[PDB]
Chains A and B, each alone.
Chain A
């Protein structure tokens, strides 16, 4: 397997499209830092380090909206959108000045910076740039 992060974001995206309570991703200190932001910014309920058949995973507790009236009862998503930017194929970095505003503010962009994993907002407050890991809304 060639990309942990891209696998991670994807493990979720499939889980939220059929409303599972949770789903597990292979554990990493970098995934904890991203789930951390994904916890705090409230796209997920939160997560916990569990163990599967002797092997370390991270169980991620998904979060959704309310049932809807109508032909399609399926509740609205909380993570409408999640996708890698920087990839092993094509590394993507931004200086502070060209840090993007995801979805006119209503979304976030996660970063890897020399000060840690930060959002579009945070990075602009601290004044630093970094590798643009992904975008979420």
Chain B
């Protein structure tokens, strides 16, 4: 632009766009599973990824991930979620926190147990 143009129009400080809308300001959000199931991921991978359909306390009803081997979640299970998509599972933009509420930690994990809600074994 010209200097004049800057005086007249100024530069435009463009806003940030939240990648965790359902969280609505919060670090975490509690919710309840309506639908628990497995869904096949996109190219170039194949699996049965574990997901929960959760109705939040913030009013949003979103699709959350169930990290780890095995779980106990079923319908009506209460759950806490945190941010973070699962790159390959489109529509999934949140993660369920293991070791919170009706979500038990992983059975038999020995490595990196905070990330999977597992107590320190004897």
Contact = CB atoms under 8 A, between A and B. Distances in A.
B46 interface: no
> What bracket does the count of chain B residues touching chain A fall in?
under 10
Interface in B62-117: none
Interface residues of A, number: 2
Contacts of B3: 89-90
Contacts of B18: none
Contacts of A90: 3
B6 to A, nearest CB: 9
A90 to B, nearest CB: 4
Nearest to A87: B3
Contacts of B2: 89
B4 to A, nearest CB: 7
Interface in B1-39: 2-4
A90 B4 CA distance: 8
Interface of A: 89-90
The 4 closest A-B pairs by CB, nearest first: A90-B3, A89-B3, A89-B2, A89-B4
4 contacts: A89-B2, A89-B3, A89-B4, A90-B3
